[PDB]
Amino acid sequence: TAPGNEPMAIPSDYKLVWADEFNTPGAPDAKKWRYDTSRNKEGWYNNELQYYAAGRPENVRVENGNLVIETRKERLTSMADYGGQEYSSGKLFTQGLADWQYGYVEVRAKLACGKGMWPAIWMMASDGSTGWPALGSIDIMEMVAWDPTTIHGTIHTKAYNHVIHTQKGSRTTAADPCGQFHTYSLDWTKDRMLIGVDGHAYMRFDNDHKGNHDTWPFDSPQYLILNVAIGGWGGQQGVDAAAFPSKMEVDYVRVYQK
Ligand SMILES: OC[C@H]1O[C@@H](O[C@H]2[C@H](O)[C@@H](O)[C@H](O[C@@H]3[C@@H](O)[C@@H](O)O[C@H](CO)[C@H]3O)O[C@@H]2CO)[C@H](O)[C@@H](O)[C@@H]1O
Ligand SMILES: [Ca+2]
């Protein structure tokens, strides 16, 4: 629904304005990432099966220059916010720490595989007053590991979203995404978004320039989100116990702006 076919690359006139190179082993940098626990006890959206553990190295850690988000089959019943889940995982976002209006986002990542796994690199608007989906969401990368070579790039707005099946997205494939790094990229300007892998946009979404927040909510800042969900879209061919633990490794997040 949002086909692209054009190169993409860090614009020559942009500077690197924000980066997490995951240089510092241990916990993620608290000045860059917060943990999202907001629906642990209730159950996450999308019929998701994971508990997202905050402050827990087994799920979220920096090692050897990479962020590691790791899913595990386990019941974290000692957690006050435990929601009865069979799995643990990690969700980090830059909410309240850093956000961007326009820019080139480049994330170099090795994905988490195993039927059930749903790694994602995405964004939501800092101003959520209009609620989901109207606020505007940018999926720079989703993969569901029943189809682990397929890379999905999607935007959601009030007009264009998955609840009403009008989401603007595309897909491509990439070599062994769980075994080798690729670059997952967004080029967002006032005119359009390109979403790509390894310097190729497979997804394009234009600003129609109608000043309709329903079709272009993207003239306000967005923060970045990294997670690995379990089940929902990831669970289309079940959740494979033998797949755990599974990890997404992120070498870096770099954000460029004019
Ligand atoms: O169902 C209404 C509730 O929606 C909440 O928002 C969720 C939404 O339900 C869920 O579908 C969505 O899922 C994300 C995808 O749209 C896509 O953007 O990729 C993400 C990464 O895979 C995936 O999580 O997430 C929305 C935000 O959590 C509202 O938060 C809630 O107020 C509302 O009642
Ligand atoms: Ca690194």
Tell me which ligands are bound.
Answer: a molecule of 3 linked components (GLC-BGC-BGC), calcium ion
Proportion of strand residues: 35-45%
N-C termini distance:
29 Å
Can you count the beta strands?
18
Helix content: under 10%
Instruction: Give the domain tally.
Output: 1
Radius of gyration equals 17 Å
CATH top level label: Mainly Beta
Number of helices: 0
Please summarize the sheet with the most strands. Answer: 11 strands, mixed
Q: Structural class given helices, strands, pairing?
A: mainly beta
Q: From the 3D coordinates, which CATH architecture would you assign?
A: Sandwich
CATH topology name, in short, is Jelly Rolls
Order of helices and strands: EEEEEEEEEEEEEEEEEE
Shape: globular
Q: Would you give an account of this structure?
A:
The protein has 258 residues and is mainly β. The chain has one domain: Sandwich (Jelly Rolls). The protein is 0% helix and 43% strand. Strands 1, 2, 4, 5, 6, 7, 9, 14, 15, 16 and 18 form an 11-stranded mixed β-sheet that branches. A 7-stranded antiparallel β-sheet has the order 3-8-17-10-11-12-13, with no helix packed on it. A hairpin with a 7-residue loop joins β11 (137-142) and β12 (150-156). The structure holds a molecule of 3 linked components (GLC-BGC-BGC) and calcium ion. Calcium ion (CA) binds next to β18.
Based on the model shown, name its key terms.
monomer; 258 residues; mainly beta; Jelly Rolls; eleven-stranded mixed β-sheet; seven-stranded antiparallel β-sheet; 18 strands; 0% helix; binds a molecule of 3 linked components (GLC-BGC-BGC); binds calcium ion
